[PDB]
């Protein structure tokens, strides 16, 4: 099934974005005075709460590239969760047509 295939592809891609985003955020934020997103472990946590939209506000990017990385994490997170929902819709719709006799 395509909907379950694209969903799985979205989840694995999300994990890649989370890891890479955690790596790129630190690389981008270091060098800017006052930045807190400068260590990998908490950067990964930041990526999670960002991708899930959430955004406690305990950690936030202050640089241009750190914020661009953030946007990518947001979109990847929203798209994946939106794709899972879309996949769940197809499963339920296809199932309802079966118990109806259509």
């Amino acid at each position, epitope marked *: 099934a395509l909907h379950w295939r694209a969903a799985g592809a979205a989840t694995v891609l999300l994990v890649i974005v989370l890891l890479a985003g955690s790596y790129l955020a630190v*690389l981008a934020e270091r060098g800017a005075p006052g930045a*807190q997103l400068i260590t990998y472990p908490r950067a990964l946590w930041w990526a999670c709460e960002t991708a899930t939209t959430v955004x406690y506000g305990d950690l936030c990017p202050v640089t241009l590239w750190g914020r661009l990385v953030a946007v990518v994490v947001m979109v990847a997170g929203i798209t994946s969760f939106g794709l899972v929902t879309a996949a769940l819709a197809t499963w339920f719709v296809g199932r309802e047509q079966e118990r109806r006799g259509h």
Partner: antibody, heavy 118, light 108 residues
Framework: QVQLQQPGAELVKPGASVKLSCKAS????????IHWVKQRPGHGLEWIGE????????NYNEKIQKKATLTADKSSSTAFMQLSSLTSEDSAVYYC???????????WGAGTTVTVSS | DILLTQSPAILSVSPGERVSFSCRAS??????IHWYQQRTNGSPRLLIK???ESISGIPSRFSGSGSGTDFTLSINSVESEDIANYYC?????????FGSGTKLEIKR
């Protein structure tokens, strides 16, 4: 084994330049940052700058004079600090340290005693 | 940038007595503070990471505490080998900064 190997000493004439080395061993991750710390005789530790060998990007302490230039060689796992236009103020022991990207300096080098004199 | 204040600069104490080093940050840094030990003509050595976490190889004599602004490095019953300079370092905000340092002296 010694994780960070630095030269014992470096003699530099006033105005000249010097390229300190920091050969690294042990475990090496792409998340590793190499830092450099300056310590003048009778003074405390002073952060100079940092560099990530896996990407090559370096940051410097902008609170002090820009004397250093950080480069790295991923082939030999050795970090370098280019000090130029040295005066008597730059005469100190320069340590290099490894950070696993988690904030603390796990291991330090023996330190290179740089003396600026004619 | 974050200023780390270590007072007093020199700390005198009798042998076999508990001692405490102070480190105060100019801003709230949670528990992102790290302690180092530097003996005469030696390189700095990590004693405590993240305020209170212990380090492999370091005697259980050393301990750490504190959060936010005030932090403390403690030594239960000091020994002669503890004679050194003690520095604190923060990793909460860029750039990383060190404290002025505290010298430990033993009154034998």
């Amino acid at each position: 084994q010694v994780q960070l190997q630095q030269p014992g000493a470096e003699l530099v004439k006033p105005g000249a330049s010097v390229k300190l080395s920091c050969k690294a061993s042990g475990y090496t991750f792409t998340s590793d940052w190499i830092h450099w710390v300056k310590q003048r005789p009778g003074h405390g530790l002073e952060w100079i700058g940092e560099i990530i060998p896996s990407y090559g990007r370096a940051n410097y302490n902008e609170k002090i004079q820009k004397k250093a230039t950080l480069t790295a060689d991923k082939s030999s796992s050795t970090a370098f600090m280019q000090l130029s236009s040295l005066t008597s103020e730059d005469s100190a022991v320069y340590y290099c340290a490894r950070e696993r990207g988690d904030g603390y300096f796990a291991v330090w080098g023996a330190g290179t005693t740089v003396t600026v004199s004619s | 940038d974050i200023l780390l204040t270590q007072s007093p600069a020199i700390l005198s104490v009798s042998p076999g007595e508990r001692v405490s080093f102070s480190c105060r940050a100019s801003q709230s840094i949670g528990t992102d503070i790290h302690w180092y030990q530097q003996r005469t003509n030696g390189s700095p050595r990590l004693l405590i990471k993240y305020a209170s976490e212990s380090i492999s190889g370091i005697p259980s004599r050393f301990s750490g505490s504190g959060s936010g602004t005030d932090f403390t490095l403690s030594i239960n019953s000091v020994e002669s080998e503890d004679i050194a300079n003690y520095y604190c370092q923060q990793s909460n905000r860029w750039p990383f900064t060190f404290g002025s340092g505290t010298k430990l002296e033993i009154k034998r």
